[PDB]
Amino acid sequence: VKKMVIAVRKDLDMGKGKIAAQVAHAAVTCAIRSMKINRDVFNEWYDEGQRKIVVKVNDLDEIMEIKRMADSMGIVNEIVQDRGYTQVEPGTITCIGLGPDEEEKLDKITGKYKLL
């Protein structure tokens, strides 16, 4: 009943393996942050099998809209960027993780998007 959502960009031509790695990046950062600042909710999520919903979004604008809504609702979220073409600079935004939180709350933000 606690779930995490990760929303993945479909316009980047990412392979199956890269998508999994990017979703895992989002999930790791959200989980660790939530363990720090939202412990009881993290624990419940984790003990219920750390359930995750993975949706796909059309473009960067959708990622940023999710971000906007998550911050407004006080939901833990992490925009994920891959490695650069340049080691010094940050890379492309691939996905965004949310939660863990209440599924009903999370669906208010991501429910509209197609499952990956």
SS3 86: coil
Cis peptide before 100 (omega within 30 of 0): yes
Position 13: which residue type? Answer: D
**How many other C-beta atoms lie within 10 A of the C-beta of residue 35?**
15
SS3 67: helix
Residue matched to tokens 């911050």: 71
Phi, psi of 54 (to 5 degrees): -115, 115
Cα gap 3→48, rounded to integer Å: 9
For helices 16-37 and 39-47, give the axis angle rounded to 10 degrees: 130
What is the fold, at CATH topology level, of the domain defined by 1-116?
Answer: Bit1 (3.40.1490)
User: What resolution in angstroms, rounded to 1 decimal?
Assistant: 2.0
